[PDB]
Design a protein around this ligand. Structure first.
Ligand SMILES: Oc1cc2ccccc2cc1O
Length: 222
């Protein structure tokens, strides 16, 4: 398949990304608590449902939530201010809460079943969100870094296999703050560092210029 792109909602961020986040890729956004990673996830879950002329892929979404941070009412707001019907947008987001890191890993295998079901339809899965990818692994493997890295490596490999095999954009969030971080090392296809700037602006930089945007009723925008 050709590489598809999903607009982030921000022209600035899209330019930094060469058009948007890519299918057949894992995009990892990392930064401190409150930097806006989950807002970017919510925005992408709407944008992907637009036609390509507006920066989407007419795609369906699968969302794995590890922190109970998915907000359907926020999806509705973004959809309504992106000219889409909010009920339709929500009907095309499959949502699951991961109870722990082992359940999170099983949910990726389950996602493949729905991906296959939708593959030949007019609304194939085009976006798989894992928010937060690292939170359960970090809390469960305190004092056991070597074992944590083994499990994370397999999880990321599963996500790669889905991105490439089914032409999906995988978008993952990772909280990194004071003294923290192996990030995801070199595993993601693309690492985006997100931070707060003056006056509520958000600033993004590729790790391995900078885009600037705001969180609004449209999700994010310049
Ligand atoms: O109905 C489902 C929703 C999911 C969401 C994310 C990951 C896996 C899922 C599996 C489902 O059957």
């Amino acid at each position: 398949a050709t590489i598809g792109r999903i607009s982030t909602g921000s022209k600035s961020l899209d330019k930094l990304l060469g058009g948007g986040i890519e299918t057949q890729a894992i995009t990892e956004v990392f930064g401190e608590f409150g930097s806006g990673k989950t807002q970017l996830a919510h925005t992408l879950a709407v944008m992907v449902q637009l036609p390509p002329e507006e920066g989407g892929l007419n795609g369906s979404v699968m969302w794995i939530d590890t922190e109970n941070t998915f907000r359907p009412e926020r999806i509705r707001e973004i959809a309504q201010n992106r000219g889409l019907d909010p009920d339709e947008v929500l009907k095309h987001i499959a949502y699951a809460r991961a109870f722990n890191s082992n359940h999170q890993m099983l949910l990726v295998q389950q996602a493949e079943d729905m991906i296959k079901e939708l593959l030949n339809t007019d609304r194939p899965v085009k976006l798989l969100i894992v928010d937060s990818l690292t939170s359960h692994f970090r809390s469960e493997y305190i004092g056991a870094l070597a074992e944590r890295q083994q499990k994370l490596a397999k999880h990321l490999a599963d996500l790669h296999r889905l991105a490439n095999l089914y032409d999906i954009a995988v978008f993952v969030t990772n909280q990194v703050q004071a003294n923290g971080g192996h990030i995801l090392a070199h595993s993601a296809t693309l690492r985006v560092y997100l931070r707060k700037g003056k006056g509520g602006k958000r600033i993004a930089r590729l790790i391995d210029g900078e885009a600037v945007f705001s969180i609004t009723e449209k999700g994010i925008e310049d």
